[PDB]
Amino acid sequence: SMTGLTEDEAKEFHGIFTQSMTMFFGIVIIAHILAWLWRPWL
Amino acid sequence: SMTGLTEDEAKEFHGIFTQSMTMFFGIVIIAHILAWLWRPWL
Amino acid sequence: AMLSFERKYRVRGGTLIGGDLFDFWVGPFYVGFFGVTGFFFALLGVLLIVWGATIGPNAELQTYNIWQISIAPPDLSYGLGMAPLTEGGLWQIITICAIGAFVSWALREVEICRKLGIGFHIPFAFAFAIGAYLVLVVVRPILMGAWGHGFPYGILSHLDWVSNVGYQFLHFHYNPAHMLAITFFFTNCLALSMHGSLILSVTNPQKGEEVKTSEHENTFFRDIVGYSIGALAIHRLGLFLALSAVFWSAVCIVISGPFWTRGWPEWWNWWLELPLW
Amino acid sequence: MSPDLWKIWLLIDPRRVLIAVFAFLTILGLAIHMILLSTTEFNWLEDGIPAA
Amino acid sequence: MSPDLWKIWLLIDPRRVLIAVFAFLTILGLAIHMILLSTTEFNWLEDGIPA
Amino acid sequence: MSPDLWKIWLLIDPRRVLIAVFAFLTILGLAIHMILLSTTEFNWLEDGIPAAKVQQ
Amino acid sequence: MSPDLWKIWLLIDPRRVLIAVFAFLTILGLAIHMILLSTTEFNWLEDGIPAAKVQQTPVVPQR
Amino acid sequence: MTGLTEQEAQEFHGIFVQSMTAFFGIVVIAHILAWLWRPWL
Amino acid sequence: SMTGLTEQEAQEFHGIFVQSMTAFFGIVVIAHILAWLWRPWL
Amino acid sequence: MHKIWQIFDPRRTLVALFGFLFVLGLLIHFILLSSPAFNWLSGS
Amino acid sequence: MHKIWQIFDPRRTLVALFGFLFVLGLLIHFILLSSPAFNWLSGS
Amino acid sequence: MSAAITEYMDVAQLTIWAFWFFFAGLIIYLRREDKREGYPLDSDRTERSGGRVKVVGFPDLADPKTFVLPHNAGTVMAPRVEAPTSINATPVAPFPGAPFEPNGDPMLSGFGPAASPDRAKHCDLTFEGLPKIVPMRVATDFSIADKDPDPRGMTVVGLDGEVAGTISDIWVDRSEPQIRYLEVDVSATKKKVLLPIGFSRFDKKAGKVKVAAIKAAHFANVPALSKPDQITLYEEDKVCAYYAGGKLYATAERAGPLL
Amino acid sequence: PEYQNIFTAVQVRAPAYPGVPLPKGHLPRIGRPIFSYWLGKIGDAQIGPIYLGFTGTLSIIFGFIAIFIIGFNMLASVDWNIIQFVKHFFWLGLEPPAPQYGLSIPPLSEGGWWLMAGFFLTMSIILWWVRTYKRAEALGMSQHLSWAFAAAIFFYLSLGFIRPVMMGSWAEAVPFGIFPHLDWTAAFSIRYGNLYYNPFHMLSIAFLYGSALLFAMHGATILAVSRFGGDREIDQITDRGTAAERAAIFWRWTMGFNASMESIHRWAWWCAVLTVITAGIGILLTGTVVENWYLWAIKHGVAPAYPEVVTAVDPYAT
Amino acid sequence: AANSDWKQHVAVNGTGVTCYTCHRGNPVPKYVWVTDPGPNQPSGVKPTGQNYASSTVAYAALPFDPYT
Numbered sequence A, B: 001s002m003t004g005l006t007e008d009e010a011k012e013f014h015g016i017f018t019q020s021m022t023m024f025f026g027i028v029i030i031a032h033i034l035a036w037l038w039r040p041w042l
Numbered sequence C: 001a002m003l004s005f006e007r008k009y010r011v012r013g014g015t016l017i018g019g020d021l022f023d024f025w026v027g028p029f030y031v032g033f034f035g036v037t038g039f040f041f042a043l044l045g046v047l048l049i050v051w052g053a054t055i056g057p058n059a060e061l062q063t064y065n066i067w068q069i070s071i072a073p074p075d076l077s078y079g080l081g082m083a084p085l086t087e088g089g090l091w092q093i094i095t096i097c098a099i100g101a102f103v104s105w106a107l108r109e110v111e112i113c114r115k116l117g118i119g120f121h122i123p124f125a126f127a128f129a130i131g132a133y134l135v136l137v138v139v140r141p142i143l144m145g146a147w148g149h150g151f152p153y154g155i156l157s158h159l160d161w162v163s164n165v166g167y168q169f170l171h172f173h174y175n176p177a178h179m180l181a182i183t184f185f186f187t188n189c190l191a192l193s194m195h196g197s198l199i200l201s202v203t204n205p206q207k208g209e210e211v212k213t214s215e216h217e218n219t220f221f222r223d224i225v226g227y228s229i230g231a232l233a234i235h236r237l238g239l240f241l242a243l244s245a246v247f248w249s250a251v252c253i254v255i256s257g258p259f260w261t262r263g264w265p266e267w268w269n270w271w272l273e274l275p276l277w
Numbered sequence D: 001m002s003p004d005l006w007k008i009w010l011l012i013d014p015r016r017v018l019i020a021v022f023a024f025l026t027i028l029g030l031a032i033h034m035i036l037l038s039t040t041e042f043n044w045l046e047d048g049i050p051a052a
Numbered sequence E: 001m002s003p004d005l006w007k008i009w010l011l012i013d014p015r016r017v018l019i020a021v022f023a024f025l026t027i028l029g030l031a032i033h034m035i036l037l038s039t040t041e042f043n044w045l046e047d048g049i050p051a
Numbered sequence F: 001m002s003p004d005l006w007k008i009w010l011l012i013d014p015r016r017v018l019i020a021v022f023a024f025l026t027i028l029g030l031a032i033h034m035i036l037l038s039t040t041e042f043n044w045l046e047d048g049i050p051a052a053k054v055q056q
Numbered sequence G: 001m002s003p004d005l006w007k008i009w010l011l012i013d014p015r016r017v018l019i020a021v022f023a024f025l026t027i028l029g030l031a032i033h034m035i036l037l038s039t040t041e042f043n044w045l046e047d048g049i050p051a052a053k054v055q056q057t058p059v060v061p062q063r
Numbered sequence H: 001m002t003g004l005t006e007q008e009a010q011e012f013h014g015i016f017v018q019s020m021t022a023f024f025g026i027v028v029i030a031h032i033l034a035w036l037w038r039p040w041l
Numbered sequence I: 001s002m003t004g005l006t007e008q009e010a011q012e013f014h015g016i017f018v019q020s021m022t023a024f025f026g027i028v029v030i031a032h033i034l035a036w037l038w039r040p041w042l
Numbered sequence J, K: 001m002h003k004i005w006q007i008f009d010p011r012r013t014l015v016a017l018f019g020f021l022f023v024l025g026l027l028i029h030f031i032l033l034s035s036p037a038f039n040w041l042s043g044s
Numbered sequence L: 001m002s003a004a005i006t007e008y009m010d011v012a013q014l015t016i017w018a019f020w021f022f023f024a025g026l027i028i029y030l031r032r033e034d035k036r037e038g039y040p041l042d043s044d045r046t047e048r049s050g051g052r053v054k055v056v057g058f059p060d061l062a063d064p065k066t067f068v069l070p071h072n073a074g075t076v077m078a079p080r081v082e083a084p085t086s087i088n089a090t091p092v093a094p095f096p097g098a099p100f101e102p103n104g105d106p107m108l109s110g111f112g113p114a115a116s117p118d119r120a121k122h123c124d125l126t127f128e129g130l131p132k133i134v135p136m137r138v139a140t141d142f143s144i145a146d147k148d149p150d151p152r153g154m155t156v157v158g159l160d161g162e163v164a165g166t167i168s169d170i171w172v173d174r175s176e177p178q179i180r181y182l183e184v185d186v187s188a189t190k191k192k193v194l195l196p197i198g199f200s201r202f203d204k205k206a207g208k209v210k211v212a213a214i215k216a217a218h219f220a221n222v223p224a225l226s227k228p229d230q231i232t233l234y235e236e237d238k239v240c241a242y243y244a245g246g247k248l249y250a251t252a253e254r255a256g257p258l259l
Numbered sequence M: 001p002e003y004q005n006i007f008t009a010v011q012v013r014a015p016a017y018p019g020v021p022l023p024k025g026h027l028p029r030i031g032r033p034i035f036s037y038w039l040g041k042i043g044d045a046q047i048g049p050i051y052l053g054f055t056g057t058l059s060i061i062f063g064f065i066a067i068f069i070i071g072f073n074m075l076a077s078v079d080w081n082i083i084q085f086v087k088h089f090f091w092l093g094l095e096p097p098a099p100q101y102g103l104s105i106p107p108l109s110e111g112g113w114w115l116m117a118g119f120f121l122t123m124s125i126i127l128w129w130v131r132t133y134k135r136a137e138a139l140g141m142s143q144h145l146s147w148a149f150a151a152a153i154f155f156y157l158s159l160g161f162i163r164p165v166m167m168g169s170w171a172e173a174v175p176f177g178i179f180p181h182l183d184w185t186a187a188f189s190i191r192y193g194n195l196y197y198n199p200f201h202m203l204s205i206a207f208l209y210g211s212a213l214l215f216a217m218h219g220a221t222i223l224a225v226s227r228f229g230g231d232r233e234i235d236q237i238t239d240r241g242t243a244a245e246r247a248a249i250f251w252r253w254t255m256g257f258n259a260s261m262e263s264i265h266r267w268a269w270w271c272a273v274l275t276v277i278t279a280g281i282g283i284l285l286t287g288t289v290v291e292n293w294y295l296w297a298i299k300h301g302v303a304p305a306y307p308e309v310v311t312a313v314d315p316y317a318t
Numbered sequence N: 001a002a003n004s005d006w007k008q009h010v011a012v013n014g015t016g017v018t019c020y021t022c023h024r025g026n027p028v029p030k031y032v033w034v035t036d037p038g039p040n041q042p043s044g045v046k047p048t049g050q051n052y053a054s055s056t057v058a059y060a061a062l063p064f065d066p067y068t
């Protein structure tokens, strides 16, 4: 607990962090599918 | 214990460290197999 | 003459040479033995400069315009020997007189600070400028091989000498010791501006305010750049930068010609020819 | 992918990793866009398409 | 490798190791991608394929 | 060679030598790879082997 | 050398000489390898031996 | 960790979301007008 | 609170601020209308 | 919306806004002058 | 979310976000002005 | 609107002349600022004239400038009047510009290198009103840096390498943490004297303090404090000047010359 | 021998000093201070904290964007080869638009990036000036430092913005590079006929040499009288002790006149500022009212004349 | 033509020009030049011809193709 957080604080932080990261990757995937449909690079 | 971690506190860092390094290398393997299939270099 | 609090400090003794023979003051100045020697070296040097202006390079180009008066060193065919008076020996005599005057000035400063009971930082710092002059007119001409490598004594002609010496190496900005010396000069100017600004700001506060303390000086620069060096350390650093600039300039000029005879950019080839790339 | 991964937040302060990852992502996005703008095959502004 | 390697972690600080390896891996990935981009055989953007 | 070499760790701090070894080995690997890439004979990317699908 | 040479360590401590020697031999080896790589007679990579098997286009003869 | 209680963060979050929505709406309408003026893809 | 400004003294500042914003934007709009009437840029 | 003034000092905000507005006006006028099609410093 | 403001001081985050938006807007307008196909300060 | 004003004058010449005018004004201003301490001068011209002609040179002096001191310490004028004093010496020769001889015993004479003015008799203060330079026996929160000698118990030796006492306490500065003084417990009078750091050399090998200013027998005449916990601007100046006098008066060979 | 006060022999550690309290409506200072032993041998051994407001954040953002653009263009100039980037780093640069554009906006690869980098860097410098002014005024001090910074900014803007606009082209501006900007400095002198003959260049060089001389003299003087407590300059200014008296008397005996403990810091302030002021004028006169400085000096009787011992025949005058 | 039409260059001291002046025994001279393309650039980047270390200008950051 060097950073000062407790177990519950870390548990509650991790879920929100993973949820937001999943949402960001999900929108990135759609942007890349659109880009590939526009002009494939491979 | 100069670092200060207890016997069991530092012993469980290893179990997660290796478990994550395994998957990192695992996805790198797939990336390199795909790259070789696309255009071999040697 | 004397400041209103100076009479307590005019004590006898502390001389290096002379004792009670030349131990007196002339107006505000203290003279001593080295005062006499330096004053008369300077007087003869000035009179010979004026006579060299009177003779001129010829009877047609002679002029009393202060920007155009120039006394030139001998030819490179004389080597390290003594030239005739009209063909470059006057330059050598004036150089000897100038060296004598500078050394006398430094020794008089040593006597003054022995009398006042203070440290010897000031003559020590002056010795660096004296050494730079000596490298310019003594060390480099001997290493090169002739007195003709010194610079001429004139307000505008020694600029021509600097320009032509600089272009003898096709690009003088690529000299590395030159870059170091220039960095030190610019940093010294910045540090002096900041020291003066801070002292004046603390001593002359906003209207209707009292004089600031020592904590404000440190807080200001900790809140601007995150570090403060202190009252004594700023003077330490100023002296260090001002002397390093001169030391590296002397190094930069003494390696041009004696130790490197090509263009200065080419010197960097050792970096470009490494096997890493 | 490990049941006790959340303990990583007991080691590194979250507030000083969010700033780092935000800055890294923003600079990465800028750099990729500029790299695409530096090539004639993927400059979407100077391509002329559509309709010139 | 001996099973007792887990004693490394009481000799070096885990947080510094984590951040150092993260930074090194990111810098290495950027460097390798750029070195590949500098070539002619392995530049996937200017290769002209597919046309 | 010597059955008593393990005394070396009673003199030099192991925590420092681990770092000074890992950093040195990483720098050495980078330097050797750069040296190889700076030649026309051992540059495995620009050697034209195998084949060349792009034009230059 | 003399049998009583082992007294040398009563003047110099093992740590500050071990570190210096280990940090010195590495630098010397690096410097020698680089010096040999710089010459055209003792460069083992570009000597052309054994054969080339690498094809070596218009050139710029100014460089 | 920032001198803010629960309610003093919920009010801020509500105002922040509403302002962000307004800004994004006007950005969208500006991009629609620009695409009508001169398309880029 | 943070700047030590009471809400009642904030309402009065906000009203004057928004009134000034409206007055400024009116002149800006009129100037742009005249500028378009001089030389249109689209 | 009015409690935004509990977050920022009104005086400093006004000064900063004025400085930003003046800089932006100078920038736009200079950009217009530099371009040839909109330069008004030629008469007509 | 909303508890994120218990981590981040609102003033600094708001100032940084506004500065970033202003810089991004200026940069995009400059990039468009540099491209001849989208420069609107010409005769067209 | 062109670059040639006349057949000879141009813009770059007028600009340099304007700079010269501004530079002359700036030099006059700086020389007038230089003359806020020590003027009008003390010379024979004033005293021969019966205190009628005042020697100030050119330019003359400025109007007085006010400094206000913190914690209600008072107000000081930058150009002020000060009382003429009678020095403790006697001229060597009657011609002008002659030196003076330090009448009496040179160390205990108050003339020459061992001279000082009379500063204000109050302690310098911090931002909260505390005394600024205090011993470590009251600044308990201070400490000596690690891996450093900690010069307590070190023997102090005189000019001739003879022991004159030991260090008892260290006087530090609250506003800027650094050492300003050492306290020496003299083993000849059972007294304690202060020693500035600028006059002491730390021999960290053998743990010694070297004082090259005065000899070992001279530590018995150092001016003392009023109270054992604080010092004033007057006493600090007196203590420093006493040691400075030893740079000339310590031995018979220090008056010169070399030849 | 005698203690010269160049290094601190024995150090003393006290708890960290947060700083003088700021008035209401200010953010707290960030960071916890730490002590460095080797740094304490030459100065104060405490680093941090720092104050970061809104102007300080904006300056950081603008400056980092500018530096990122410069670095990206330097990397693009070697075709994304990072090793070749390290090899050629001192020779690389980002350079102004071509002379055939005047004051217009060229494409990105032909000078648009240079314009954007210059704009952002100028914005960051202005914001940092505002930050220095605000921090000076927050503690009740005066504004000498902001005036000196304003003079430096004036020279910087003359070098990069004002003169190109007066000349009517962006190609007159200086590139972003180590060796490129030295090349610009050399070419500027060559093109306008030997800048040694510019009188404001002469004045600027005089003031730079004078700044070095003044700092050496002042540093040596304060170090020489620091055994009397001379480093505490504020006390000496408000209550003159032996340090100030001896420092004045030394120079009066040496060269016939002296300054004061308060007055010398004015000589320091004006000498440095005049270095850049006369610089900014010197290049605003170049190319606008003077075409060739050597011919200008000949016209005004400044250039010396030499005997004709070597000469050439002009092939354009046959 | 060199030995008869350009004597204000190659005949000040009567040195002259022969085939050996350039070839020095080689079929191809050792010091010829062509129009230099410079270092490779990205496809959409316009070259500057400078800011690159080159021996053709004696290792300065000046335009490296003054021949053309």
Ligand code: BCL
Residues within 6 Å of the ligand: C102, C129, C130, C132, C133, C162, C163, C165, C166, C167, C172, C173, C178, C181, C182, C246, C249, C250, C252, C253, M185
């Ligand atoms: C084309 C020319 C080249 C060039 C060629 C040279 C050459 C050649 C030299 C320099 C030297 C210098 N160059 Mg360069 N330099 C160039 C461009 C620059 C640029 C620039 C912005 O481009 C800068 C900032 C510099 C800066 C410098 C300094 C590092 C250095 C000068 C200071 C010095 O030596 O102090 C030295 C100070 C002294 C010698 C003072 C001595 C005074 C003593 C005390 C005597 C007393 C004076 C007097 C008699 C007292 C009485 C007077 C009155 C009666 C009161 N150069 C260009 C590219 N440069 C010089 C150098 O390094 O010298 C060591 C040098 O020789």
Ligand code: BCL
Residues within 6 Å of the ligand: E032, F022, F025, F026, F027, F028, F029, F030, F036, F042, F044
């Ligand atoms: C002729 C040129 C050949 C080539 C010939 C060789 C040869 C020969 C060697 C390498 C080696 C290496 N090459 Mg190679 N290499 C080539 C092309 C590449 C390319 C590429 C872009 O194509 C890459 C990314 C690499 C990268 C590498 C690294 C994987 C490795 C050096 C690692 C290091 O720096 O250790 C420095 C850092 C450390 C030593 C840290 C200490 C590591 C720890 C303490 C010990 C191992 C634990 C480990 C981290 C985890 C478990 C591993 C277990 C041992 C299984 N090569 C080309 C094709 N390469 C070396 C190697 O095999 O190393 C394994 C080697 O001998």
Ligand code: BCL
Residues within 6 Å of the ligand: I027, I028, I029, I031, I032, I035, J018, J021, J022, J024, J025, J026, J032, J040
């Ligand atoms: C096509 C190019 C046109 C042109 C088209 C436009 C258009 C469109 C606009 C301007 C605007 C401006 N133009 Mg224009 N402009 C041109 C050329 C000029 C010339 C010139 C030398 O030729 C001048 C002096 C100006 C002057 C101005 C400024 C008054 C104004 C931007 C100021 C600013 O940045 O506010 C920033 C600084 C502040 C906001 C600080 C405010 C200080 C206080 C509030 C002053 C208020 C005083 C008072 C209360 C005002 C009301 C009273 C009125 C007199 C009725 N323009 C050319 C001819 N110009 C803008 C404008 O109208 O702004 C009002 C605008 O929309």
Ligand SMILES: CC[C@H]1c2cc3[nH]c4c(c3C)C(=O)[C@H](C(=O)OC)c4c3nc(cc4[nH]c(cc(n2)[C@@H]1C)c(C(C)=O)c4C)[C@@H](C)[C@@H]3CCC(=O)OC/C=C(\C)CCC[C@H](C)CCC[C@H](C)CCCC(C)C
Residues within 6 Å of the ligand: C038, C041, C042, C043, C045, C046, C094, C095, C097, C098, C101, C102, C105, C122, C123, C125, C126, C128, C129, C152, C153, C154, C155, C158, C242, C243, C246, M209, M212, M213, M216, M217, M220, M254, M255
């Ligand atoms: C080393 C760090 C800097 C420095 C330091 C420094 N200078 C110093 C000191 C110090 C510490 C002094 O104590 C001393 C002094 O008294 O200062 C007031 C001094 C001094 N630095 C001076 C000048 C000076 N310093 C310069 C440089 C520097 N000084 C460095 C940048 C320069 C430059 C850069 O050009 C100059 C011009 C003097 C004002 C003074 C020393 C005065 C002196 O020595 O007086 C004795 C000599 C005479 C009075 C007459 C000499 C007679 C000769 C015949 C004169 C001509 C000689 C010359 C070779 C021919 C003409 C040359 C042409 C180019 C014109």
Ligand SMILES: CC[C@H]1c2cc3[nH]c4c(c3C)C(=O)[C@H](C(=O)OC)c4c3nc(cc4[nH]c(cc(n2)[C@@H]1C)c(C(C)=O)c4C)[C@@H](C)[C@@H]3CCC(=O)OC/C=C(\C)CCC[C@H](C)CCC[C@H](C)CCCC(C)C
Residues within 6 Å of the ligand: C186, C187, C189, C190, C193, C194, C224, C225, M059, M060, M061, M062, M063, M064, M067, M124, M125, M128, M129, M132, M145, M146, M148, M149, M152, M272, M273, M275, M276
């Ligand atoms: C009197 C004239 C002299 C002078 C004066 C002067 N300079 C000044 C001042 C003054 C009075 C200030 O007040 C100001 C200052 O802050 O001083 C401490 C300053 C200053 N003079 C400076 C430089 C400077 N001064 C120079 C010269 C001079 N300054 C003259 C000789 C020079 C030269 C000779 O070239 C330089 C380079 C600055 C250090 C500082 C003003 C800094 C400033 O305005 O910065 C604004 C922009 C930024 C902060 C952008 C930062 C963006 C990011 C942080 C970048 C991230 C990447 C990073 C760089 C990677 C590397 C790692 C980092 C952790 C370092």
Ligand SMILES: COC(C)(C)C/C=C/C(C)=C/C=C/C(C)=C/C=C/C(C)=C/C=C\C=C(C)\C=C\C=C(C)\C=C\C=C(C)\C=C\CC(C)(C)OC
Residues within 6 Å of the ligand: J031, K030, M067, M068, M070, M071, M072, M115, M116, M118, M119, M122, M156, M157, M159, M160, M161, M173, M174, M175, M176, M177, M178, M181
């Ligand atoms: C890891 O690091 C990364 C890769 C992220 C970034 C690294 C970057 C690196 C390595 C950068 C290195 C930079 C270097 C070496 C820079 C050197 C800079 C030097 C020496 C600069 C010196 C002088 C430059 C000057 C004086 C330029 C001045 C230009 C000015 C004042 C121009 C102003 C222009 C304006 C205001 C134009 C306005 C016109 C408009 C607004 C229309 O433009 C859009």
Ligand code: HEC
Residues within 6 Å of the ligand: N017, N018, N019, N020, N021, N022, N023, N027, N028, N029, N032
């Ligand atoms: C003296 C009279 C001769 C003779 C007999 C030749 N040369 Fe030259 N030469 C020069 C250059 C620049 C070239 C082109 C480079 C090249 O082609 O190699 C040549 C070319 C030739 C050739 C053709 C060689 C080949 O590649 O097949 C031959 C046969 C030839 N030369 C004969 C340059 C110069 C000179 C410099 C100005 C001078 C002088 C000469 N050559 C003189 C001769």
Ligand SMILES: CCCCCCCCCCCC[N+](C)(C)[O-]
Residues within 6 Å of the ligand: J030, J033, J034, J035, J036, M102, M103, M165, M168
């Ligand atoms: C910021 C100071 C005011 C600058 C005003 C001039 C702007 C540039 C105008 C240049 C016009 C040149 N040209 C050929 C297009 O007419």
Ligand SMILES: [Ca+2]
Residues within 6 Å of the ligand: D043, D044, D045, D046, D047, D048, D049, D050, H040, H041
């Ligand atoms: Ca498109």
Ligand SMILES: [Ca+2]
Residues within 6 Å of the ligand: A041, A042, E043, E044, E045, E046, E047, E048, E049, E050
């Ligand atoms: Ca492809």
Ligand SMILES: [Ca+2]
Residues within 6 Å of the ligand: B041, B042, F043, F044, F045, F046, F047, F048, F049, F050
């Ligand atoms: Ca291959």
Ligand SMILES: [Ca+2]
Residues within 6 Å of the ligand: G043, G044, G045, G046, G047, G048, G049, G050
């Ligand atoms: Ca081989």
Ligand SMILES: [Fe+3]
Residues within 6 Å of the ligand: C195, C199, M218, M222, M233
């Ligand atoms: Fe000072």
Ligand SMILES: [Mg+2]
Residues within 6 Å of the ligand: M095, M175, M180, M183, M184, N050, N051, N061
């Ligand atoms: Mg260039």
